[PDB]
Design a protein around this nucleic acid. Structure first.
Ligand SMILES: Nc1ncnc2c1ncn2[C@@H]1O[C@H](CSCC[C@H](N)C(=O)O)[C@@H](O)[C@H]1O
Length: 249
DNA sequence: TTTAAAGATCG
DNA sequence: ACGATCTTTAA
């Protein structure tokens, strides 16, 4: 199982085996919520359509793809012992929020992801990254993970857009996998959760397969009722299980 | 300016 | 999911 170079929510590494089992074969893979791209990095499709609402995330991916060697040499210089302290971290975080250069922002973004608190990605209403210092012993520089991403990305297109627009890029030879933000166990609204299901039912009706992963709750059962859903027992957090909704035509 | 409740901030 | 301290919202 290949590892992503970013710390990110929805790593789904223990679920990668289960996703691949229920993921239909196809020419292209559409991923509306790509995030760290663990599925993209652990599958074998000829083409990829990868999208996310996070503009920093998509901008980083393009730069890693198009300017690989340049980016790696610049980002590696930030992973040295003297950058592992609060004062330097908050200046880098400020430099990121004031930078207008996509390349420089992409470099700092990896630093903030690996040195930041719990690898979180948080913004205020001004679009300013405000995650505090993480205080780790020795943050890992994912050089191998970076180069592997860049190679894999040669057959991929990245778009910063909502799920509705990205899924509309799907043709007959494409498969769609969806990993939306988790459903409430007790932001991404409930309407969007149900909307995603509606669009999914549209694609199948049109001969495009769709696979959706989420928690196993009462709401997810109802949203994904028109799909041959399967369950997997991760069983921890009450104990909650993961639901895999498959819209096979 | 008053005001009570809600939302936003960021370590 | 935390919390002291900001800003916001409406009459
Ligand atoms: N409305 C939207 N349209 C497209 N992408 C979205 C979106 N809302 C959130 N996303 C992206 O989708 C990704 C989901 S990763 C979330 C995985 C898992 N469900 C969890 O909640 O932990 C995030 O990186 C986020 O940037």
């Amino acid at each position: 199982k290949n590892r992503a170079f970013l710390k990110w929510a929805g790593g789904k590494y223990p679920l990668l085996d289960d996703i691949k089992r229920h993921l239909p074969k196809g020419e292209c893979l559409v991923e509306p919520f790509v995030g760290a791209g663990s599925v993209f990095l652990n599958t074998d499709f000829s083409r990829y359509i990868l999208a996310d609402i996070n503009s920093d995330l998509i901008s980083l991916y393009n730069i890693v793809k198009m300017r690989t060697d340049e980016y790696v040499q610049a980002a590696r210089e930030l992973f040295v012992p003297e950058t592992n302290c609060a004062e330097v971290y908050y200046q880098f975080r400020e430099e990121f929020n004031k930078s207008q250069d996509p390349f420089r922002r992409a470099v700092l973004f990896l630093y903030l992801n690996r040195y930041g608190y719990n690898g979180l990605c948080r913004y205020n209403l001004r679009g300013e990254f405000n995650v505090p210092f993480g205080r780790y012993k020795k943050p890992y520089f994912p050089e191998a993970e970076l180069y592997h991403f860049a190679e894999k990305a040669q057959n991929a297109f990245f778009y910063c857009e909502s799920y509705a627009d990205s899924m509309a890029r799907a043709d007959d030879s494409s498969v769609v996998y969806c990993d939306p933000p988790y459903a409430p166990l007790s932001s991404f609204t409930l309407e969007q959760q149900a909307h995603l299901a509606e669009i999914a039912e549209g694609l199948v009706e049109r001969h495009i397969p769709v696979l959706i992963s989420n928690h196993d709750t009462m709401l997810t059962r109802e949203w994904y009722q028109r799909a041959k859903l399967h369950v997997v027992k991760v069983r921890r957090s009450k104990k909650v299980d993961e639901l895999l909704a498959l819209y096979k035509p």
